[PDB]
Structure formats: C-alpha cells, structure tokens
Amino acid sequence: TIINVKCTSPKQCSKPCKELYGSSAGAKCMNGKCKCYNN
User: Fold this and answer.
1) Is there a contact between 3 and 30 (Cβ–Cβ < 8 Å)?
2) What secondary structure does DSSP assign to 5-23, as a single string?
3) 3-class SS at 25?
4) Which of 11, 23, 28, 39 could bond to 35 as cystine, CB 3.0-4.6 Å?
5) Whole-angstrom Cα distance, residue 17 to residue 3?
6) Cβ(17)–Cβ(29) under 8 Å?
7) C-alpha gyration radius of the chain
8) What is the spatial distance between Cα 9 and Cα 30, in angstroms, rounded to a whole number?
9) Domain extents for the chain?
10) d(CA 27, CA 1)
11) 15: alpha, beta or left, given left = phi > 0 and alpha = psi -120 to 50?
C-alpha cells in the first residue's frame, strides 16, 4: 500500500493518507514519495 504523493516530511503524507484511511493512517515519507498504511 504505496501511493504517489511527493513529500519532504511524513506530515505532507498525512494529508493524502488521512483523506484515504481516515485517522488510522501510517503515513511514511521515504525519498520524496508517500506511503499509506494503517495504525
């Protein structure tokens, strides 16, 4: 469960992932791309 949103922070990735998974989002920023998991 990896998406394609450009980031430079995990709080730039908690924008698409909390629009997806709600509030149970494990939002990780590796390189400059976003991953959306679950808490």
Assistant:
1) no
2) ---SSTTSSTTTHHHHSTT
3) coil
4) 28
5) 9
6) no
7) 8
8) 9
9) 1-39
10) 10
11) alpha
